[PDB]
């Protein structure tokens, strides 16, 4: 079977570079135009670059021109993407992709690798800022209030969040993190509690970010 196995990606800082490599197998590599196509975290597909059979002709998406270089080696069965001068834009899943070759003008992509992730992250290891989300009852069931913590700008995953040192587990919803354009993560944890308890019960979110050896216990108060 055809395989297109991408490697050489992963975490890189904005001032760094990567050399993606696709190992092609199970077909006559030299017979086909080859491509890189990328898919950004929550976005669609974007063609990046292609190269003709023998390597003398290359094309690029406007926004990667002068930053990336595509190349191939028909003996090693490799396709390469040298990624220099990086941008937040470049955080994406990078697929190695074969053009079926039906048309001289229109690339038609008949075989795709599984892709390899690139993250352009402004920090290699950063602890979160933790902000309280003061209780509100505008959107909860009558007699309850939702309060939380915003766990912002950390890298890499994971963080753990508990409430009241684990003594409050009911009504807790910790949302999946978003990977921001900065290459840092943010998430929220929200607990729904009785509104009457706001005067009496202390609520503290316990945030642990092991990679940065950071722990924050943020008290969340009503905001009269």
């Amino acid at each position: 079977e055809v395989q297109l196995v991408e490697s050489g990606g992963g975490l890189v800082q904005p001032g760094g570079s990567l050399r993606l490599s696709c190992a092609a197998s199970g077909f006559t590599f030299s017979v086909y135009y080859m491509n890189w196509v990328r898919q950004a975290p929550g976005k669609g597909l974007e063609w990046v670059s292609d190269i003709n059979n023998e390597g003398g002709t290359t094309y690029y998406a406007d926004s990667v021109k002068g930053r990336f270089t595509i190349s191939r080696d028909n003996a090693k069965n490799t396709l390469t993407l040298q990624m220099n001068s990086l941008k937040p834009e470049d955080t994406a899943l990078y697929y190695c992709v074969r053009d079926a070759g039906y048309s001289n003008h229109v690339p038609i992509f008949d075989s795709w690798g599984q892709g390899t992730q690139v993250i352009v992250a402004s920090a290699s290891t950063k602890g979160p800022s933790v902000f309280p989300l003061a209780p509100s009852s505008k959107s909860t069931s009558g007699g309850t209030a939702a309060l939380g913590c915003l766990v912002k700008d950390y890298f890499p995953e994971p963080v753990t969040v508990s409430w009241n040192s684990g003594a409050l587990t009911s009504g807790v919803h910790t949302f999946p993190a978003v990977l921001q354009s900065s290459g840092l993560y943010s998430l929220s944890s929200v607990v729904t509690v009785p509104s009457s308890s706001l005067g009496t019960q202390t609520y503290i979110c316990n945030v642990n970010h092991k990679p940065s050896n950071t722990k924050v216990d943020k008290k969340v108060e009503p905001k009269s």
Binding site: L45, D50, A100, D110, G115, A177
Partner: protein
């Protein structure tokens, strides 16, 4: 700019049409429309090219056409495994193709459930740190597809928005988050900001004010 519906639904055995247009102009045969399918956690797969040619091995239930100045993909007799993201690609000019944003097709397997939306304003603490984040939390929805729009007063705001792809919760419904980053001055100087969540043609909008 190539335009596709963010999401669509179909029942098992049902028929559904996905469309693919241009913001400026009509789609015709010389845009050579191509359709790709991406099932969850997998690489894209070629379905149809040259408007209506099925790739080898693609089921006959998938059909491509051009209708009303757009490319169209019709799935007749939808199967559970047809739940996927569908991307169209159009040829506008050399050297390659432009992709639509993709359509998330859900093949309905449980009853529809409307999202709960909670919007938190920036904390006083965060403002003191010279930053401002609005936090829009979205839960308990099915199908697992929403669109989020933010407004400053009544005007749409695009820049500074980060939104997660929906993920399945414990209870098999979906959750997502959207964040709007502002300067403290932006936050203070507007009458309000709004998070508007669209789900299956219905909209829920929460608004907060400094």
């Amino acid at each position: 700019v190539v335009t596709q519906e963010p999401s669509l639904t179909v029942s098992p055995g049902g028929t559904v049409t996905l469309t693919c247009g241009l913001k400026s102009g009509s789609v015709t045969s010389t845009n050579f429309p191509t359709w790709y399918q991406q099932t969850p956690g997998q690489a894209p797969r070629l379905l149809i090219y040259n408007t209506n040619t099925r790739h080898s091995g693609v089921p006959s239930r998938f059909s491509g056409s051009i209708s009303e100045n757009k490319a169209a993909l019709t799935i007749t007799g939808a199967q559970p495994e047809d739940e996927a993201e569908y991307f169209c690609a159009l040829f506008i000019s050399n050297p390659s193709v432009e992709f639509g944003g993709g359509t998330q097709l859900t093949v309905l397997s449980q009853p529809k459930a409307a999202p709960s939306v909670t919007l938190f304003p920036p904390s006083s603490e965060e403002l003191q740190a010279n930053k401002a984040t609005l936090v829009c939390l979205i839960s308990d929805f099915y199908p697992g597809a929403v669109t989020v729009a933010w407004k400053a007063d009544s005007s749409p705001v695009k820049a500074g928005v980060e939104t997660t792809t929906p993920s399945k919760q414990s209870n098999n419904k979906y959750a997502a988050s959207s964040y709007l980053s502002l300067t403290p001055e932006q936050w203070k100087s507007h009458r309000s900001y709004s998070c508007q969540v669209t789900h299956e043609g219905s909209t829920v909008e929460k608004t907060v004010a400094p």
